[PDB]
Amino acid sequence: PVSVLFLCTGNTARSQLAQVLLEHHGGGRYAVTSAGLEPGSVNPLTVQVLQESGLPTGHLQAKGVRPLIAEHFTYVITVCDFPNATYRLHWPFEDPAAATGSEEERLAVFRHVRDEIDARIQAWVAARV
Amino acid sequence: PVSVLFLCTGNTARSQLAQVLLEHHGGGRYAVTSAGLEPGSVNPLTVQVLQESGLPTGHLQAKGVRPLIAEHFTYVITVCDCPIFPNATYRLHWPFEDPAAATGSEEERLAVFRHVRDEIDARIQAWVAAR
User: Fold this and answer.
1) Which residues of B touch A45 (CB under 8 A)?
2) For a disulfide at B99, which of A23, A27, A120, B116, Cβ 3.0-4.6 Å?
């Protein structure tokens, strides 16, 4: 399969959303990984908005990129504003975890970013047949 | 000032809680540091529960312990279930449940973070008063 690595800063939100959404829309065609430069912890709101869409999240872990330093990926897609890859793509998305307000207000931002990443991934899988 | 290093695995939660709480309850009598063996990033839920208590968090950073090993610490206090500190006078162990291991909604996770905050807060107040 085609290997994709999604990279954000903490591996808590954007790169996790992208990982799960490519797993959904791409199916077995893609071996998908996500990582951050400084791993944190998966944000509960990330899980909430993915689960709202019926997407499973029990396999999600915030992980650092260092143990992957020697790996090669067909695509390394940076989702926040890696040495060895065929293609390096940049898809900047707003950090939903930087939004402030009540849980409901923040969830709205998480949903907006989820839907935007979902749209980009759908178009990207389709433009590859 | 009495020097204290709080040490957990990631420097994201338990050791940051303890640092801020000793800063608060100890005043300027303690030089407080925290570090982790494999540093991550400060957990936003750690920040939230400290801020709910009126405790400032803008100075918090996740950091590795390696630059600190040869430092003189009166106390090196591990709060997770560890380097050799030749210039540490005392080594204490205060195990606490890892709040970052909690799953569930934000409210459910914040409940564990608050429980652990409250326990560390109690231990630090008691320890400051000791002797």
Assistant:
1) 106
2) B116
User: Rounded to an integer, what distance in angstroms lies between the CA atom of residue A87 and that of residue A68?
Assistant: 16
Is residue B125 part of the annotated active site? The answer reads: no
Q: Residue B118: what residue type? A: D
Cβ-in-10-Å burial (0-12, 13-18, 19+) of B69 comes to middle
Q: Which helix (H) or strand (E) holds B6?
A: strand B2-8
Cα separation, B122 vs B41, in Å, equals: 25
Method: X-ray
Site of tokens 């002797």:
B131
- Quick check: is B76 catalytic? no
Task: Exactly one of B82, B92, B122, B126 is catalytic; name it.
Answer: B82
Phi/psi of residue B100, nearest 5 degrees: -75, -10
Q: What is the stated resolution of the deposited model, in angstroms?
A: 1.6
Residues of A with CB under 8 A from a CB of B: 10, 36, 38-41, 43-45, 48, 62, 64, 97, 103
Q: Domain residue spans in chain B?
A: 1-131
- B106/A40 CB distance under 8 A: no
Phi-psi region of A31 (alpha: psi -120 to 50; beta: other; left: phi over 0): beta
SS3 of chain A: helix, strand, coil, percent, to 5 = 45, 20, 35
CA proximity to A19, closest of A6, A28, A1: A6
Helices (H), B27-105: 44-52
* Residue A53 in tokens: 């869409």
Cα separation, A78 vs A98, whole angstroms: 17
Q: Which of A76, A57, A61 is nearest to A12 (CA)?
A: A61
